[PDB]
């Protein structure tokens, strides 16, 4: 069976000051595909748009060939932010693309550097903490050197780096430096430097652990509410009175780990009147059939300020 390449367009409407809807309609036309073998998915800056409910409309059929298009609704503020919108066309296993963006000038977009600390789960349970330096908005990956220095000692490990080409014609470079735990508890600082022959000076970002007074978190668990008898059951885990805000929460269903996409955790919120305390809420919603299978759930919390080996579990059981 031969492979027939279709033609993919990406057209859209414009803004209207004399209107009140403030929406932009995006059209991705596909001409010359095969019947019942097409699928159009939408992206915005390498992030898939799940909550849109896009509509797919057939145009015509010419024997063994047909034409379809898909329509997307976006706001005016999303369009005016100069983000790239992509429709990905899948036909017989191959992929075809079309991109669009608001027209602008050739202004030299600056590069941004982010340095993020290791997670407490790798720090205090797994034992392999890594720092990652993220470099964004590069026109090309060539002639870019990313170096790592320390503050107290000198023996740095090997830093593996990777390059990614995005849909918005920008390149990203991420380098990962594996560090030891005890140097991070003791409080030494690291630094990531990014250089280029066209830069006047290197861009330097430094990091260390959060300074302050350490407080161990007190966690509590709640049963499903007494007014709930529907098809789903909600379980809660209130964790409060801790500093700093770096914390890790994971649920355990009968001593088996639950994936991180099955539960959500709120952003930490400060309180206690400049005493620097935080609280979060952890929510995990299961169905009635999973709840009624005599399981035994567990909310496990790992924090720096806890006593060794730095973990805390509370048990929710329907019998007790």
């Amino acid at each position: 069976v031969n492979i027939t390449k279709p033609t993919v367009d990406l057209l859209h409407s414009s803004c209207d000051p004399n209107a009140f809807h403030s929406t932009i309609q995006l059209y991705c036309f596909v001409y010359g595909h095969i019947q019942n073998d097409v699928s159009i998915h939408w992206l915005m800056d390498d992030r898939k748009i799940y909550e849109t409910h896009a509509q797919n409309v057939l145009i015509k059929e010419e024997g063994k060939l047909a034409s379809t298009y898909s329509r997307l609704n976006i706001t005016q503020q999303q369009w005016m932010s100069e983000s790239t919108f992509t429709c990905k066309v899948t036909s017989q296993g191959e992929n075809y693309w079309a991109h669009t963006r608001r027209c602008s000038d050739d202004e030299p977009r600056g590069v941004i550097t982010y340095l993020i600390p290791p997670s407490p789960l790798d720090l205090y349970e797994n034992g392999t903490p890594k720092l990652t330096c993220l470099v964004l908005d590069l026109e090309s990956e060539e002639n870019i050197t990313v170096t790592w220095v320390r503050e107290r000692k000198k023996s740095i490990g090997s830093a593996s780096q990777r390059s990614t080409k995005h849909h918005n014609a920008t390149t990203s470079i991420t380098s990962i430096l594996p560090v030891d735990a005890k140097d991070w508890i003791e409080g030494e600082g690291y630094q990531c430097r990014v250089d280029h022959p066209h830069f006047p000076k290197p861009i330097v970002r430094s990091i260390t652990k959060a300074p302050g007074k350490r407080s161990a978190p007190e966690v509590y668990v709640f049963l499903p509410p007494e007014e709930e008898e529907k098809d789903k059951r909600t379980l809660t885990c209130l964790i409060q009175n801790f500093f700093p805000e770096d914390i890790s929460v994971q649920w355990l269903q009968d001593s088996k780990l639950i994936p991180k996409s099955q539960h959500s955790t709120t952003t930490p919120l400060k309180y206690n009147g400049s005493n620097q305390r935080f609280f979060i809420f952890s929510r995990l919603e299961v169905t009635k059939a999973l709840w009624t299978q005599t399981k035994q759930f567990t909310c496990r919390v790992i924090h720096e300020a806890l006593r060794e080996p730095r973990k805390l579990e509370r048990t929710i059981s329907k019998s007790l």
């Binding site: 202004e107 030299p108 977009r109 600056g110 941004i112």
Partner: protein, 212 residues
């Protein structure tokens, strides 16, 4: 006749690499042919014109300049500084007199043009401008002395400039005040010599008085 005056036609005393700066002697618009002596970093340069034109400044242009016209005296030296930063706060003077004037400007490097500029003096903001322009400060008093810096956006990235100290004085410091401390420092040697001679003279006279 009088002392020569050296001035900059882009009168900013802090510039970046690749900038154009023109050094002028006593003052006219006439690049004369072999009539002006120029001294850079305490060394005679080969540029004998009345206008020293630098087309692209380098780090090796950051010294001291003295011009001397024919029939005139040497000039008061001016100082140039060539730096390489993401954001530079320019100035036309680092020490200014009372009831004087100076300008500041926030300038980026090599087509990274800056927008949304905020000017600070001793970590207190006093001026906001969308564009990078002159901020003229007229009728300088004692309150204008402090540390100056600026912030801005290259495209959407916030960058900060290094702090620059500008001092307002009632009179210029003239850098050679210890030279007049020589003559009392010579009198304290001469009087010590006098006392050392007096002690020996009195000892010799007291020893010859015991002989008689």
């Amino acid at each position: 006749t009088q002392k020569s005056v050296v001035s900059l036609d882009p009168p900013w005393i802090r510039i970046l690499t690749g900038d154009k700066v023109t050094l002028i002697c006593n003052g006219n618009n006439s690049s004369q042919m072999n009539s002006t002596k120029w001294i850079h970093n305490d060394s005679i340069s080969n540029v004998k014109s009345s206008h020293w034109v630098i087309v692209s400044a380098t780090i090796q242009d950051s010294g001291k300049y003295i011009c001397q016209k024919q029939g005139f005296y040497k000039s008061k030296p001016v100082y140039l500084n060539v730096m390489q930063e993401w954001l530079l706060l320019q100035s036309s003077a680092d020490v200014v007199l009372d009831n004087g004037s100076f300008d500041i400007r926030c300038r980026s490097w090599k087509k990274w043009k800056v927008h949304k500029v905020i000017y600070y003096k001793d970590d207190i903001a006093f001026k906001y401008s969308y564009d990078s322009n002159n901020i003229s400060i007229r009728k300088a008093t004692f309150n204008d002395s402090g540390s100056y810096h600026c912030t801005g956006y290259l495209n959407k990235v916030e960058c900060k400039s290094d702090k620059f100290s500008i001092a307002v004085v009632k009179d210029y410091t003239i850098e050679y005040r210890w030279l007049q401390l020589i003559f009392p420092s010579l009198a304290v040697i001469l009087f010590a010599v006098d006392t050392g001679l007096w002690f020996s003279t009195h000892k010799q006279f007291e020893s010859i008085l015991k002989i008689q």
